[PDB]
């Protein structure tokens, strides 16, 4: 999913300074228990920007040959402030090279935003509305292509595409289409905002989003949430949850989980496993903060190994331990989180099965998963679904939904099996 490259960058400090900011240190950890020094910002027309090599999110390994390993924040700052005007940096980059490789919806190769916008306008305005054409277009374009369509639509009609579709569509189909027209962060932010109703908060939707999104996704959600609603996501969580459930949700929503490490820390894997047992099944009652700290701070690959080592000590695996130890929203949040850590595509496959298996449909959950995972890991979700349930995700959608709504969801599924 990611690539790591190292590189020596040589900067000359000009009248505007080096032109970048840093975070980190043993006392100001960027992510949980990470003491590294990271570039947080790069100023324009500064030395780093005009050089081009340094990038935000870079880890700074050394300055003028001095290693930035396990330093106080101030000691790293002092090494920069006491450097000369010729500054040599060894830096580590982190590059994401996955994209939509495991998504079911790909960018349409022969895309033409103006053509799509015109054909959707025509479909909206034909007598009776041509929902088939609207579904065929919008579910067979990537999210960013949909944004270009919406821009071209507004330019030619002087009306917003989402407003026009609110009038042209109804029912679950409208929910699907309007969801697809939001960016991933806008969609997640709006779903979280809608779930927070004070004492009527939709904990299940809160849990699903907060427990399953990564650091990078949550950082974008936090930024977009603030722009859209003029309040920080964390503040709305605090005012709409309570108890240990609130502390868990707040911790997860920060999106500061330890990032994937190069070295597997076997000693910490074992110690975390013992701690989880000692805090839960081994004792009367539960030390919930210890569970929260471990499960929100460690990297996902680390915790995967922790949960297996936990079985060496405990007669019960982590999931059945949660069921035995806690109840209510807190129990449901831990259960979702542990499933997300162990196998995220299987987590979504099981949530999709649950949304359809019984009487009627939990359309809110079904739609949200099909919209939000279609460009992420729907191909992996489909593989886990077929392996566990024998029939395909496509088949269950077909049995539980009908009409143009069904057709849109099957396009988001992408194919059978």
């Amino acid at each position: 999913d990611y690539l790591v490259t190292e590189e020596e960058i040589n900067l000359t400090r000009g009248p505007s300074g080096l032109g970048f900011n840093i975070v980190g240190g043993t006392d100001q950890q960027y992510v949980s228990n990470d003491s590294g020094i990271y570039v947080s910002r790069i100023k324009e027309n500064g030395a780093a920007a005009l050089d081009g090599r340094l990038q935000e999110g870079d880890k700074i390994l050394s300055v003028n040959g001095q290693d930035l390993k396990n330093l106080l924040h101030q000691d790293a700052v002092d090494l920069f402030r006491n450097a000369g005007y010729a500054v040599s940096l060894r830096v580590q980059h982190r590059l994401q090279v996955q994209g939509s490789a495991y998504g079911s919806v790909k960018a349409y190769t022969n895309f033409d935003a103006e053509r799509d916008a015109l054909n959707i306008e025509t479909a909206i305005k034909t007598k009776g509305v041509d929902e088939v054409t609207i579904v065929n277009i919008l579910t067979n374009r990537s999210n960013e292509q949909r944004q270009d369509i919406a821009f071209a639509y507004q330019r030619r009609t002087k009306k917003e595409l989402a407003s026009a579709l609110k009038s042209a569509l109804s029912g679950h189909l409208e929910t699907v289409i309007l969801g697809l027209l939001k960016t991933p962060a806008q969609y997640d932010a709006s779903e979280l905002k809608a779930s927070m109703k004070g004492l009527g908060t939709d904990e299940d939707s809160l849990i699903e989003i907060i427990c399953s999104r990564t650091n990078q996704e949550l950082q974008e959600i936090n930024r977009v949430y603030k722009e859209m609603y003029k309040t920080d996501l964390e503040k709305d969580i605090i005012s709409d949850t309570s108890g240990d459930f609130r502390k868990l949700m707040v911790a997860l929503a920060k999106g500061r989980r330890a990032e994937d490490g190069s070295v597997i820390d076997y000693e910490l894997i074992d110690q975390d496993a013992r701690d989880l047992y000692d805090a839960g099944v081994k004792r009367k009652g539960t030390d919930v903060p210890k569970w929260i700290s471990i499960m929100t701070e460690r990297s996902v690959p680390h915790l995967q190994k922790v949960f297996d080592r936990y079985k060496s000590y405990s007669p019960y695996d982590m999931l059945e331990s949660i069921r035995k130890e806690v109840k209510g929203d807190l129990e449901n949040a831990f259960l979702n989180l542990v499933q997300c850590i162990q196998n995220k595509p299987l987590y979504f496959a099981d949530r999709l099965y649950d949304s359809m298996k019984g009487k009627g449909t939990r359309d809110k959950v079904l739609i949200r998963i099909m919209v939000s995972r279609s460009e992420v890991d729907m191909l992996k979700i489909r593989s886990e679904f077929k392996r566990k349930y024998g029939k395909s995700l496509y088949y269950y959608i077909q049995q539980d939904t009908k009409g143009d709504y069904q057709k849109a969801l099957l396009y988001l599924c992408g194919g059978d099996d």
């Binding site: 300074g17 080096l18 032109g19 900011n21 100023k43």
Partner: peptide, 5 residues
């Protein structure tokens, strides 16, 4: 707390 350099 970020530090400008």
């Amino acid at each position: 707390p970020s530090t400008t350099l």
